[model samples]
Target: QVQLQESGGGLVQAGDSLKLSCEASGDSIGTYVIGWFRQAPGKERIYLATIGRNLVGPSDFYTRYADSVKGRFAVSRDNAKNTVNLQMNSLKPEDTAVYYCAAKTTTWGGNDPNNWNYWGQGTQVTVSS
Candidate 1:
């Protein structure tokens, strides 16, 4: 089995982007699509985006890695470092979510559109002035 851990700050100033990284273990970095999701203070789970594996195509909410907010959002990673990065630009209070990184594959069964079944513990990002 594979395990994932997230390490990053949970705070960001309004107008400042939130940056996070996910450290993965026990899997081939190239074989999975590392994805991100969010849950706000009082909202349902929101799909952010993903990175990795031959582009299984974007989810309904996200048409591409650069989708949302005029393409200011993106998910990237460095396989050699076993770390994945999430960047949400032009941040505002509404952009906050308990950000999470997930390692996804077809091996997991779900109707979520994207095959993200494994997730990290998650890190929160709250924006304020």
Candidate 2:
């Protein structure tokens, strides 16, 4: 069965950087898009960004970031290791949350931001002093 293993979370200081990673199993990481999300105050998960190979071009990549985190976060993937990462910099206290990531088919027709097939365990991150 396909699985996504998540890691990289802990206490961080304000204005610091928090990098998150997701490792893929049972599938070639390149064949799927990894979308980032986090559980906010109300227990609802919100979309942050997605990282994947470009579907309309050659063997390239693309990323979509939410306006909220566009200036503080970025996404990247390492095809050689079947892994993807979400890096957040210049963090604020409000950045504290439980982060999660989902994987979806790497196709435009099936690419809805919420249309995911698998999800990883949540990683709790707290930003403070």
Candidate 3:
């Protein structure tokens, strides 16, 4: 069984940068595809970024971000801590949302939406003055 938990919450002033974290347990932090998602109040879920993956063999890890968030948002992981971090800069009220961390088992092939089967409880973030 795999489990993910989100940490770091509270108000984030508009125009400031914010960092959210997710810790993983029950599996090796680097063995799966880790990513972040967001859900605005009364809105649909959005895929934010892909932190990376630990390939089946001894392969290199890589990270990718959604087109719209490519430059402003970043994702990284601390293998030692079993935690993944998501950072967003120049936040605005529109950026307020419930952030989530998720993991998916991969097979060295392309991505499959259905593979994103695990998710965290989610962290609510509000951006205001």
Which candidate wins on lDDT? 2
Q: Where is model 3 poorest over a 10-residue stretch in terms of lDDT?
A: 106-115
lDDT of each prediction vs. the true structure?
Answer: 0.69, 0.81, 0.79
In candidate 2, what are the lDDT values of residues 1-129, reduced to their tens digit?
358877899999998898999888888787787888888677667888887765545644787888899978988888789888999999988888989888877545232446688899888899997
If the candidates were sorted by their TM-score against the true structure, best first, what order would they fall in?
A: 2, 3, 1
| TM-score of every candidate | 0.78, 0.86, 0.85
Which candidate should be chosen as best, given TM-score against the real structure? Answer: 2
Off by over 4 Å in 1: 55-63, 66-70, 107-115
What lDDT score goes with residue 61 in model 3?
A: 60
Residue pairs with backbone atoms closer than 3 Å in model 3 (clashes): none
RMSD of each: 4.8, 2.6, 3.2
Model 3 C-alpha lDDT versus the unseen true structure: 0.79
Runs in model 2 with CA error above 4 Å?
55-60, 106-113
lDDT of 1 by residue, 1-129 (tens): 568887775788988877788888897555676776777888877666666556445432222342444377766656678787777788988877787777766544432435566778888788888
Worst 10 residues of 2 by lDDT: 106-115
